[PDB]
Design a protein around this ligand. Structure first.
Ligand SMILES: [Pt+2]
Length: 193
């Protein structure tokens, strides 16, 4: 009847996540547990002998609520423990780059429904060098920044990177962020001037 604990949700996709937990607290290890979904309009009640569950068929940018309750026999139920789980936005799609003239590189992508903002990470590759972290992109807007300046201190995204130095190879690594403050999986692209 002892509550669950060290609860953790391994995110495999923006559509399914694996909840894995522990219980013990005396009585060795031989119990049964019940999980509850609240994805509204329908209430789902999953019961698993093992201390882990596969929750599938979820929405990317939305957060669901789950409750885990350990049981032993029948009415022999224990206590409820509740977790709030946010899933990943769909990663940025149509990731593209188009360099215009040796010191300038334009890179375009299409965000997706769930995304509210993007986080780009720009790095040079090979130099006796930068690694800037362009936080807070927006969908549908057009940006244009010299990233080397920042070192010293429809629904698409249009970002031109100027002031680039020839002969050096760059990576752009773009992550999709949601209003709930949770990053999706990254999408990278390379270009060299
Ligand atoms: Pt469900």
């Amino acid at each position: 009847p002892s509550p669950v604990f060290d609860i953790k949700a391994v995110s495999i996709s923006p559509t399914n996540v694996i909840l894995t937990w522990k219980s013990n607290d005396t009585a060795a290890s031989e119990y049964k547990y019940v999980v509850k979904h609240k994805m509204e309009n329908e209430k789902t009640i999953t019961v698993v002998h093992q201390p882990w569950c596969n929750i599938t068929g979820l929405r990317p940018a939305t957060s669901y609520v789950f409750s885990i309750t350990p049981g032993i026999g029948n009415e022999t139920w224990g206590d409820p423990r509740v977790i709030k789980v946010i899933t990943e936005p769909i990663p940025v799609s149509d990731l593209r780059v188009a360099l215009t003239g040796v010191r300038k590189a334009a890179l375009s992508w299409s965000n997706g429904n769930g995304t509210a903002s993007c986080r780009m990470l720009l790095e040079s590759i090979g130099s006796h060098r930068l690694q800037v972290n362009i936080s807070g992109l927006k969908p549908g807007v057009q940006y244009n920044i010299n990233p080397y300046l920042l070192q010293s201190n429809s629904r698409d995204t249009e970002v031109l990177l100027v002031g680039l130095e020839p002969g050096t190879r760059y990576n752009a690594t773009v992550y999709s962020q949601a209003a709930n403050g949770t990053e999706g999986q990254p999408q990278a692209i390379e270009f060299r001037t």
